């Protein structure tokens, strides 16, 4: 949560990084990671979704936000009302002048009884659509490996809404709704995996092995580069004659 509304020109991921909330899997994890990194910001704007007839702000034992249970801060775990889970049919127009990135998900319970307990319907259904695109996810009820005390999962999906387009969320169960949207941007932002420390110094080029000078035209440090880096080459050395015979 310390990274809320953060912005970067280079997000550096550490090999020691770990997840400590509800176990989740992102179908096409690479695509979401890459587009979020290219966006360069986690600027999140909450929106007034009117989830009628359901319990908002669900949580789990695995995801301890404070003294007790919690959940992802940018997701809303909808749960049955007293004894009903209506067919949510909410909508959100994009009257703004920029693309909106909505991150949502679908819950995968471990057992049929768990599914019926969280959601009155024996089988769930999530549909998230725009004027052109659409996605529908059918929850799968089955036991996964024990992770942080849970055999269930959450499958994370994303939708991008252009200006003038409108989002529609229609669900009958197993909806991990969004709390808003991430303001997308276009620019120089990217992401990198590196264990190297960060220091107060100047460098136009960055690599997982650390910053390197860019005076020379070629480099043999790493093929992963950011900035005005020299072109990667397999040769360890290349002596150019700055003199005569």
């Amino acid at each position, epitope marked *: 949560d310390v990274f809320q509304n953060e912005t970067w020109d280079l997000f550096v991921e550490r090999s020691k990084a770990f997840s400590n909330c509800y176990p989740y899997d992102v179908p096409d994890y690479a695509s979401l990671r890459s587009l979020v990194a290219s966006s360069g910001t986690l600027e999140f704007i909450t929106e007034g979704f009117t989830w009628t007839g359901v*319990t908002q702000n669900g949580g789990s034992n695995a995801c301890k936000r404070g003294p007790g249970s919690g959940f992802f801060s940018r997701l809303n775990w909808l749960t049955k009302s007293g*004894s009903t889970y209506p067919v949510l049919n909410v909508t959100m127009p994009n009257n703004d002048n920029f693309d909106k990135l909505y991150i949502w998900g679908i819950h995968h319970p471990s057992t049929d009884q768990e599914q019926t307990s969280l959601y009155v319907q024996a089988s769930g259904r999530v549909t998230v659509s725009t004027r052109r695109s659409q996605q529908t996810i059918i929850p799968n009820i089955g036991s996964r490996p024990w992770v942080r005390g849970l055999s269930s999962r959450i499958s994370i999906y994303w939708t991008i809404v252009k200006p003038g387009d409108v989002l529609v969320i229609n669900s009958n169960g197993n909806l991990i709704a969004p709390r808003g949207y991430f303001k997308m941007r276009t620019g120089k932002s990217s992401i990198m995996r590196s264990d190297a420390p960060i220091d107060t110094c100047i460098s136009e080029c960055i690599t997982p092995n650390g910053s390197i000078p860019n005076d020379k035209p070629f480099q043999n440090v790493n093929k992963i580069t950011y900035g005005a880096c020299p072109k990667y080459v397999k040769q360890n050395t290349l002596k150019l004659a700055t003199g005569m015979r």
Partner: antibody, heavy 120, light 108 residues
């Protein structure tokens, strides 16, 4: 053969905290809601809250938001409720009850009721 | 928060007769009401759920009716064991609420 059996009676001083327990036998404890209800003379049954032990999803009544705190141990099929900062008004019987879609979330089985007496 | 009133708070009856017990909600709860029995010495028991569905194992002499804000439970041919305490509970709106309950006696 399905039942919920709770802890014995409790005698607490004001300002203390007590963890009532409820073991469940005869079914998959992780799948059904365990719902905690308060009863005392005149006021009658008063629903405290519920927990889905498998997920740990906890959900409280507003009047007991800070008073109660549910927990579950799936290995022993045991739910727990930690009543904190006890006062004389908390003296009451507390029931744990099984709930699920089988009975349309009406509590189809109940514990025997653990009594708590708060007094200095 | 759905408050309730279950009437009459006191019911006087004798074995063998048929009776009805009323429950009223502050606002609509559709069809979701349940009727429970409490007697000393053992666990509370679920009689009816969803207003009119009979719980398994319960004798058919218990039968519920109603909807919206008005509900009733008919207890027919009172056995001597049926003289216990009874509660009505909503499970439509989330904060489940119980009626104050009714006392059913015998040999009136």
């Amino acid at each position: 053969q399905v039942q919920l059996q709770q802890s014995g009676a409790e005698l607490m001083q004001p300002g203390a905290s007590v963890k009532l327990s409820c073991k469940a036998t005869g079914y998959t404890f992780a799948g059904y809601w365990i719902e905690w209800v308060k009863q005392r003379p005149g006021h009658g049954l008063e629903w405290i809250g519920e927990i889905l032990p498998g997920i740990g999803s906890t959900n409280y009544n507003g009047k007991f938001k800070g008073k109660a705190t549910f927990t579950a141990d799936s290995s022993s099929n045991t739910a727990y409720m930690e009543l904190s900062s006890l006062t004389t008004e908390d003296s009451a019987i507390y029931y744990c009850a099984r709930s699920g879609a089988q009975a349309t979330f009406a509590m189809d089985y109940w514990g025997q009721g653990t009594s708590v007496t708060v007094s200095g | 928060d759905v408050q309730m009133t279950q009437s009459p708070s006191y019911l006087a009856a004798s074995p063998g007769e048929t009776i009805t017990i009323n429950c009223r909600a502050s606002k609509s709860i559709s069809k979701f009401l349940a009727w429970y029995q409490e007697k000393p010495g053992k666990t509370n028991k679920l009689l009816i759920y969803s207003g009119s569905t009979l719980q398994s194992g319960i004798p058919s002499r218990f039968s519920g009716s109603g909807s919206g804000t008005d509900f009733t439970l008919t207890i027919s041919s009172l056995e001597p064991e049926d003289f216990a305490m009874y509660y009505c509970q909503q499970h439509n709106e989330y904060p489940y609420t119980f009626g104050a309950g009714t006392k059913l006696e015998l040999k009136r």
